[model samples]
Structures are given as structure tokens and as C-alpha cells.
Target: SERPSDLVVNRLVLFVVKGTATSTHATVKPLILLEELGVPHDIYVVEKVSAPWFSEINPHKMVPAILDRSPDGRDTLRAWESTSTLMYIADAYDKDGTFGGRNVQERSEINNWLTLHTAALGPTAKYWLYFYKLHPEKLPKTIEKLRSNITVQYDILERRLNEPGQQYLALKDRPTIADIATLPFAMKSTAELFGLEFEKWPKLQEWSVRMGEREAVKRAWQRVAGFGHGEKEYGMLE
Candidate 1:
């Protein structure tokens, strides 16, 4: 029941790396999207990336990877990188563009914001947490720099959401991958770090709260709560 390194047998398997402290910080987008679309899948918790054969699913050795049997059922496709995996899930299941996009303009904007997260918010959250929660020495200067960087990212989000009638990131009417992509970075644990919880960024906080309450988001979070507790179905989150 604990062969995470074994070949994927699930029709759709979401690979989650064992984070520093059981943090699902890196896997929010795909997990939520799959649930949002009612995509039945199995969550495969990777207790160790260096576990032999895990690299076949992700050579870069990152979480938020996926192994899915193709629609034709003849091949298994692998997608890695958190945002890339999100795009894969949306493209495969969200054909109507509910969370992906409705047109080129929408798709273009969604990708733009997603890229912004990949470049700014995601890395900022990673190092912010590293410096705060896991860094060996926890340099104050580095933490300050990280703090300012995160602040700048939050400022951008606040401004965007503050736009006239724009509630989400890419679209005005609904939340797209761009919106879902940034939700986890702005979520409680990460937001609580470095004095950024609901005070300096009201609109951003509003947006984060808005996304957090969705049924799919809740389902995704609940599924990943106790992953990799070994000796129990390899920690599949439902």
C-alpha cells in the first residue's frame, strides 16, 4: 500500500512531494482544478523524490506533477511544474474554459497572471517561508528583502482586484486559473508569515477568502491534509 515509487496505475494520478513540514503550499492549483471539474483522480504522495524511479514522473524532482493515462488509453503523459500542471488539468478537463478561459483574450490574460505568480509570488512565498520557517540562520536582512518582495506581489494583486468590477485576476466575471493559482500563496499560513494577514492588502485578502470558501478548494485542501503518514495506502488523500 506504500509503493509511491511504483509505476502509476491510477487513470489520473497527482504527485505531491513531501514538503518540508507537510505543507501543500506547492500543489494548490491542480488539486483544486481537478476537484472543481469533478475529475476523479488519485493523489499519490511522494514521501521522497530521491526515491528511485520517481524521476520518471518528474526529472526536475518537483511536486505538483501528474501522470495521466491518455484519452486513448495507450500512453501515459507526464506534466510537471505547478502552473504547467494546472494548465494541463484545465486543458484536459475544462474544455468550456470555465477556469481556463473563454477566448484568446481571456487565455492570454490568464497566462499572464499565472506567469506572474511563477515568477514572483511563488518564489517569494518559497523563500519567505524558507527564511522564516526553515532557514538555518534566518538572516534578518534576507527576511526583510523577502518581505518587501512579497509586499510588492501583494500590492500588484490588490491593485488588480481593486480594478473596476474585477473580482478575480484574469477575468471580471469569474475566477480563472490565474485566480486559483495565487490563492494558496496568499492563504493563511503563508499570509500569516511576515505580517501580511488581511491588513495591508484588503482586496487581496478578500480575494483569498473568496477562493478559500469554494467547495472544490475545501475538498482539495482536506484531501492533502495528512499526506505521507506512511503505512496507510501510501497517503492517498481520498
Candidate 2:
């Protein structure tokens, strides 16, 4: 009866912060992928990230870190940053390459869209959110610029998803990591932040609803909040 309290005992472990009802942290993508793949994993919410091991797991000291161990118990690995975490999960878990992609072109497109979300959409929305929430009085001008910038980013997505055959980000048939990676920013929180009327981007609006309603995504939302949320937690050891 020597169970590890860390929940690193026999499965992947994901560390994260608390999330709202409509949106979780950027780690949202990783959680969705984990749910999609049905990986045996645990979740640990570090309300303060005060655990000493946290620094060892992630140099930058962020809440989004992961621990994965070989089932045979021979090896363990750790990953951080939501994008990197998703990539790691995809490569490690998706042997059939469903979400990671089946061919070079598919992988490249996935990476392209993933990079676009990581570099442009995620960062722009986050910074704008902070400025709007933390220092709203300082610069209306800057706020306007940030708003327009995110709009342009949305326009890019609108153009892509609005394509005749393209419903997802990188693939026409199904959503890969690319779609998962971009969903949070396109979802409620950021939309409400910018007062962006979804009517302006019909395709994006529809896509968001679709992604949010996926069976895997719904389960992920419940699990994410339930784990690392109350008094219990699990995830990440290598």
C-alpha cells in the first residue's frame, strides 16, 4: 500500500492553475488532447506554484507542466509551456498521428497553425487582457491598438475557416492540435474582453461552438476543474 501522494504513481501528470467555468488556462489544449486520446493521467492544480519541485519541472516557473512515465516504469519525462506541452503529448501519445497528423504536409500545416496561435493569437490576447485588467487607466490608445491587432488576428482565422472546405484550423476533415491550440483565445473570455461580435466572424463563431461541444472537450473541462481545483491534486514528476 505504498501509493505516491504525488499521483505520479502510474500515469501522466498534468499541473495547472484554476480555471473559470467557460475557460481554463492556456493548458486547455493539452487537456483536450489528453481527453481525446484517453490517456491515463492525473491533474495537480498548484494554486500558488510554491512547491519546490515546480522549479525543477519548469525553469520559467509556470503552472502548465507535465509528467509522463513509461508504463513499464523505466523512464520519465517532463514538459512545460502549453504549446510545448501539447506538442509533447501529441508526439508521445498519438502513434497513429490523428491529431499530430499523418504526413509531412499535414504536420507542417498543424505546426503552422499552432505557431500562429502560440505566437500571435495567444500572446496578443493575454497581453491585452493584462493591460485591460491590470492597468486600464494608462493607455486608451494602446488598448485600441491591441484590440485592432487581435481583430486582425481573428480576421486571419476567419479567412481560413471561412474557406469553402475548411472548417478547422489546419485540416478540412478534422481538428488536430492546431484547432485545439487556438480554441481558448477564440472562446468566450477573449471574445468578451474585446467586445468582438461573433457575427462578424460567422465561421469562427460556429467553429468555437463545435470545438467546445466535443465529447472529449466537455469531459476535459469537467476533469480539469475537478482536479487540482479543490483540496486534492495530481500530476508531473519527471
Candidate 3:
């Protein structure tokens, strides 16, 4: 007899916000990875991040959550953290080992950089943006702390990119989840926000441009461009 939860499970569902904000970076990360892997998935745009159903999907009610139903027809797997979501998709869908990693050692190296992005870069960038844009009151001390932290993270990346013949963050020859995870935060917009001159970080700047130009990355940007709220809502437009 079929169980109550035993139903025909469909495609992977990705939850994304309908606003143009730094949080959208999380949305783009997995989308680009999915595109690179040529995986069939659905993007569920949520106008309200606080929606009750979203809370059910992710207790924190965050965008970029995923509902993956691949393991069993009866069980729905839920993943909320963006990095976790990317790791899950890459492990399950990237059978060719193209983007995830080819072997244990390669995957370890990939995880090293992915951890840096998730623990250091992502949080620093998020808090920096919050202080700069979303905070109701100006908090110079908090802003300075975030800015300094982000600069330290960027300096680490810049130095890594400057290493001998190093092209990508983790791998020497190809782009991986590590690069995809960092690009959205390491782009021109972030540089501008922090008043950073990319010319100073030549290798990082060049790598950012290289990653941003890829067809998958470009397509991912386009995919989320129209889904978000325009500048008018935030009063950035006339």
C-alpha cells in the first residue's frame, strides 16, 4: 500500500526573493551552479520572505531555500543555507564531477574555499550591506567593523589570486563552486559600495570579470533580474 506522503515527486524547487538586494546573491549562486550542471529545476519567487509556507520550508524563512525530492518519492529534502543547497545539488546532480570535484582531494580543496566564502565572506558582506543600506540609524562603529572585516576577506582572496599561476580560487584550471560562491559579493557593485579601487586588487578584479562573463553566470544574472523589485520601491529612482 502506498503511504500518504508517497506521491510523484517532481523537479527541484529553489526559493528566491522578489527584490533587488544583496540577499539575491544567495539566489544567483545556486542558479548559476544549476545552469552549469544543466539540471532541471524550478525557481519559486516569493514576494514576501515572511510567508508562512516559506517558514515551513525554512525555519528562518530565508530565500534560496530548496526543496529537493530526489532520494525517495515519499520524502522531501529541505535545505536552507545557500552553501548547503549548492553542495547538495552538486553532489547529487553533478555526476560528471565537472563543477563539484573529480575526487576526494579535489573536493576537499573545493570545500576549503567554500567554507571561507560561507563563514567569512558571506557574513561580512551581508552585514556590511545591512549597515550601509537597511539600517535605520547610522552606526559608524558597526559599519567600520563590517567594512574592515570585508576588506580583510578580500585581501585574503586577492593574495590567493596573486599566487603563482593561480587562475581560480580553488582549482588551477577550472571554475568551481568556490568561485561561483564568491563572485556575486566580489563584483564591481561591492567594490563601489566599499569605495574600493579594484585596480589595487588586480588579480581578484580580473578573475571577477572572467567569472562574470561566463555564459552560465550571465544567464543566472538575467534569470533573477526581472524577478526582483525595481529601485523605485526603495526610492533609489526618481
Task: Compare the candidates by TM-score and give the number of the best one.
Answer: 1
Number of colliding residue pairs in model 2: 4
lDDT of 2 by residue, 1-238 (tens): 3323555545677877766653365767788999999887777766556656677777788857887885467888888888999989988899999999999999989999999999998888877877777773767787778889999998999999988899799999999998998887887556876888767888898999999889998887776666644555334323
Note the Cα lDDT for every prediction shown.
0.80, 0.80, 0.80
Pick out the ten consecutive residues of candidate 1 with the lowest summed lDDT: 1-10
Cα displacement (Å) at residue 213, model 1: 1.5
Residue 237 displacement in candidate 3 (angstroms):
27
Q: Could you tell me which residue pairs clash in candidate 1?
A: none
Better of 1 and 2 by TM-score: 1
Instruction: Give residue 22's error in model 1 in angstroms.
Output: 4.9
RMSD of 2: 3.7
Off by over 4 Å in 3: 1-9, 19-23, 228-238
Query: Rank by TM-score, descending?
Result: 1, 3, 2
Alpha-carbon RMSD to native, per candidate:
2.8, 3.7, 5.7
lDDT of 3 by residue, 4-119 (tens): 23222277877777646455778888899988888887666665666665677788878788877856567888778889888888877988777799999888988999999999
What does candidate 1's lDDT look like per residue over 1-238, in tens digits? 2344454556778888543444686776798999899997887776677765677678888788898888788888888988889888888889899998989999999999999998998888788778887877869898889888988888898999899998888898888888878988776666775676656788888888889889999988876665565455454555
